[PDB]
Design an enzyme around this catalytic site. Structure first.
Site, mmCIF file in Angstrom:
data_model
loop_
_atom_site.group_PDB
_atom_site.id
_atom_site.type_symbol
_atom_site.label_atom_id
_atom_site.label_comp_id
_atom_site.label_asym_id
_atom_site.label_seq_id
_atom_site.Cartn_x
_atom_site.Cartn_y
_atom_site.Cartn_z
ATOM 1 N N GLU A 22 0.825 -1.204 0.000
ATOM 2 C CA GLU A 22 0.000 0.000 0.000
ATOM 3 C C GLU A 22 0.862 1.256 0.000
ATOM 4 O O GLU A 22 0.540 2.235 -0.684
ATOM 5 C CB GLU A 22 -0.943 -0.007 1.201
ATOM 6 C CG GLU A 22 -1.954 -1.145 1.202
ATOM 7 C CD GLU A 22 -2.729 -1.245 -0.096
ATOM 8 O OE1 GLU A 22 -3.277 -0.216 -0.548
ATOM 9 O OE2 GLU A 22 -2.790 -2.355 -0.667
ATOM 10 N N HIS A 25 -13.150 -11.942 -13.666
ATOM 11 C CA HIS A 25 -12.731 -11.038 -14.737
ATOM 12 C C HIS A 25 -12.997 -11.628 -16.118
ATOM 13 O O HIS A 25 -12.112 -11.676 -16.970
ATOM 14 C CB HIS A 25 -11.258 -10.685 -14.567
ATOM 15 C CG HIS A 25 -10.911 -10.169 -13.205
ATOM 16 N ND1 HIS A 25 -10.802 -8.825 -12.923
ATOM 17 C CD2 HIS A 25 -10.650 -10.819 -12.046
ATOM 18 C CE1 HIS A 25 -10.488 -8.668 -11.650
ATOM 19 N NE2 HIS A 25 -10.389 -9.862 -11.095
#
Lengths: 98, 596
Positions: free
Chosen positions: B357, B487
């Site tokens: 992150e 996906h």
């Protein structure tokens, strides 16, 4: 909620002269087609309001700026500041600047 | 009159409003995510479509500009980004039904319910449960039953929807002057600017095949080793002449092989590197984790995160009714606002997630000087590569030793290094062939080369040919396995997860090259090496301002995405496999089946 009371000029035909304030609100015409005081195909508003918020990062926060510009016209000076002075010592041969 | 000089005023006018509008919309979304409650829903929605209500006219106004003579590269790029009409090119009657069909596939795929025939009152979903049934289990009947139930009750109704979705998307692409929608996915991976850096949409198809043939021997050896371990675990169920089934990979679709790591441990005597108990003994809280993640970034040369990230962003312990999502995300709201949304615990996995992150956040502020429309990566595979680089370089035992988390008297040897290398490989190198196969199948079915009836058989044949996996059950044309995937129906590109990996090791290698280190690639760390701080920053401070072909030149020697360091990262693993699977034939035969 975003302070929109502060405005800045975004579009103008030419730049400002030194120490010049312009408050014109004419609809800027970036293109060649004249606009009768309305936005459109190539007409946009010169003034844009800020969206300042406390969550804005450094450099995007509101900043109060004061510029003190001194003028020295041949008239006698009126704005003179600190008059720092010493203590009064007497009974001693000394030089003074009363 | 002139058009080039009057486009700048329009660009500035659009960007000034877009900055604060997107900031407000992102703030509303962040408030909704941080506070899971009704009050923060409608307002968030009240922003969302509103941004769309503003994104159309700026796209609509980007048709009167003849973008074919502007010599300003940045202005032309911005105008081209603004000139894409999106879905506003088809008719309204077809557009509404396309939106409806997208919504219904999204709802149906997320509400899959399969009930056991013996207990028809217990249906499960893709949520843990049915996923946990085969995520951690040693069986052959229940795994196959779950696979068949999922691909029959979720893989059946999505096929007719996908049938019309394909043709409607292709017709939209043709309306956008694309012969096929694979070109639409390959539009971003293409530049038409400076000479010598030119790339074409069709170049990706041949280049990916060019860069996939050099890892086939290593994948074959790893496949043989996994098959031998499966024989040692499942006797008389996996044919040495053939290969392993699909449900025994570890995941329902074979995307990750992490679940099979426990069943394929080379040396169980040497444990994996674990310092979570050490972290607990050292009294490491979320703040300590977040400040230790900062030292790694600041020791290379990267700047410090500004004030407000520790205050505005949520950090840990949502606790009571003030509910927040625990999915680790980095949000760049604009106008100097960067925030993190994650739930921290005492775990090395959490440490790596925090490092990832922070890498994303650093990459985001790196191109902050770019305008609103250019604060994006060159391709989708740069953000993840940057995030994974710091996770890669923080997984070294040397880093844990130097940060006071591992014993300085450690005696790490080749055995534990090989164990960690195989554990990493089961996650990284074991997913490239499957992603390749899915992307290739999607491209070739969007191209229309195959008829409608040759859909499942060709998919399964290429799965046996490339991945080396046979069909657990026979499949007919009425089924649809790709539709049973996240996906495939949400309109998400899947090549994004491939090229990024090809970059990562490359970048790492180059970073390792700028690390003053001698030895294995996995052990070398970018920490305590300031020289690599600026070099990496060369790709960080560009973003969408420069093409990816030009971007891949200030760190790596060659701009081509040739996967060189993959064969050398797992070099001890490769030379150990060469000394392990001598008695087991490597490869697979596409004639043997579990059912016959």
């Amino acid at each position: 909620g975003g302070n929109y009371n502060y405005l800045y000029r975004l579009f103008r035909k030419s730049n400002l002269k030194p120490f010049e304030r312009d408050i014109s609100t004419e609809i800027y015409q970036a293109g060649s087609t004249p606009c009768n005081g309305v936005k459109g195909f190539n007409c946009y508003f010169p003034l844009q309001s800020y969206g300042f918020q406390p969550t804005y990062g450094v450099g995007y926060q509101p900043y109060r700026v004061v510029v003190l510009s001194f003028e020295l016209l041949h008239a006698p000076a009126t704005v003179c500041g600190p008059k720092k002075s010493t203590n009064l010592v007497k009974n001693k041969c000394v030089n003074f600047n009363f | 009159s002139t058009i080039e000089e009057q486009a700048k005023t329009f660009l500035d006018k659009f960007n000034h409003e877009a900055e604060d509008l997107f900031y407000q919309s992102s703030l509303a979304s962040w408030n909704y995510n941080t506070n899971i409650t009704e009050e923060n829903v409608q307002n968030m929605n009240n922003a969302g479509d509103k941004w769309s209500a503003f994104l159309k006219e700026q796209s609509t106004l980007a048709q009167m500009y003849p973008l074919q003579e502007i010599q300003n590269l940045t202005v032309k790029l911005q105008l081209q980004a603004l000139q894409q009409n999106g879905s506003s090119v088809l008719s309204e009657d077809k557009s509404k039904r396309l939106n409806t069909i997208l919504n219904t596939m999204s709802t149906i795929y997320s509400t899959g319910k399969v009930c056991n025939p013996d207990n028809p009152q217990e249906c499960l979903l893709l949520e843990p449960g049915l996923n946990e049934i085969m995520a951690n289990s040693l069986d052959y009947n229940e795994r196959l039953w779950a696979w068949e139930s999922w691909r029959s009750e979720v893989g059946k109704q999505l096929r007719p929807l996908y049938e019309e979705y394909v043709v409607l998307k292709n017709e939209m692409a043709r309306a956008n002057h694309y012969e096929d929608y694979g070109d639409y996915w390959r539009g971003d991976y293409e530049v038409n600017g400076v000479d010598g850096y030119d790339y074409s949409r069709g170049q990706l198809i041949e280049d990916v095949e060019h860069t996939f043939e050099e890892i086939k021997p290593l994948y074959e050896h790893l496949h043989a080793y996994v098959r031998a371990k499966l024989m040692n675990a499942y006797p008389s169920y996996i044919s040495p002449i053939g290969c392993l089934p699909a449900h025994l990979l570890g995941d329902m679709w074979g995307r990750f092989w992490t679940n099979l790591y426990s069943l394929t441990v080379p040396f169980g005597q040497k444990p994996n590197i674990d310092v979570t108990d050490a972290m607990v003994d050292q009294a490491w809280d979320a703040q300590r984790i977040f400040k230790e993640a900062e030292k790694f970034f600041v020791s290379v040369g990267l700047p410090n995160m500004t004030q407000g990230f520790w205050e505005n962003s949520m950090l840990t312990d949502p606790g009571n009714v003030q509910k927040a999502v625990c999915h680790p995300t980095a949000w760049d709201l604009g106008k100097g606002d960067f925030r993190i949304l994650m739930c921290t615990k005492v775990t090395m996995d959490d440490f790596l997630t925090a490092h990832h992150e922070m890498g994303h956040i650093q990459y985001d502020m790196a191109y902050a000087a770019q305008p609103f429309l250019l604060r994006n990566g060159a391709n989708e595979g740069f953000h993840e590569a940057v995030g994974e680089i710091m996770s890669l370089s923080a997984a070294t035992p040397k880093h844990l030793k130097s940060i006071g988390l591992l014993s300085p008297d450690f005696q790490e040897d080749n055995e534990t290094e090989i164990n960690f290398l195989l554990k990493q490989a089961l996650t990284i190198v074991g997913t490239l062939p499957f992603t390749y196969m899915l992307e290739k199948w999607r491209w070739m079915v969007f191209k229309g080369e195959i008829p409608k009836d040759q859909w499942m058989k060709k998919w399964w044949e290429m799965k046996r040919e490339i991945v080396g996996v046979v069909e657990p059950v026979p499949h007919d044309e009425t089924y649809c396995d790709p539709a049973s995937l996240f996906h495939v129906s949400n309109d998400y590109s899947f090549i994004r997860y491939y090229t990024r990996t090809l970059y990562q090791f490359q970048f790492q290698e180059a970073l390792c090259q700028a690390a003053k280190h001698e030895g294995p690639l996995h052990k070398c760390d970018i920490s305590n090496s300031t020289e690599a701080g600026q070099k990496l920053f060369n790709m960080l401070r560009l973003g969408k301002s420069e093409p990816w072909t030009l971007a891949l030149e200030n760190v790596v020697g060659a701009k081509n995405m040739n996967v060189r360091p993959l064969l050398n990262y797992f070099e001890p693993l490769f030379t150990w496999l060469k000394d392990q699977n001598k008695n087991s034939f490597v490869g697979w035969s596409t004639d043997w089946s579990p059912y016959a």
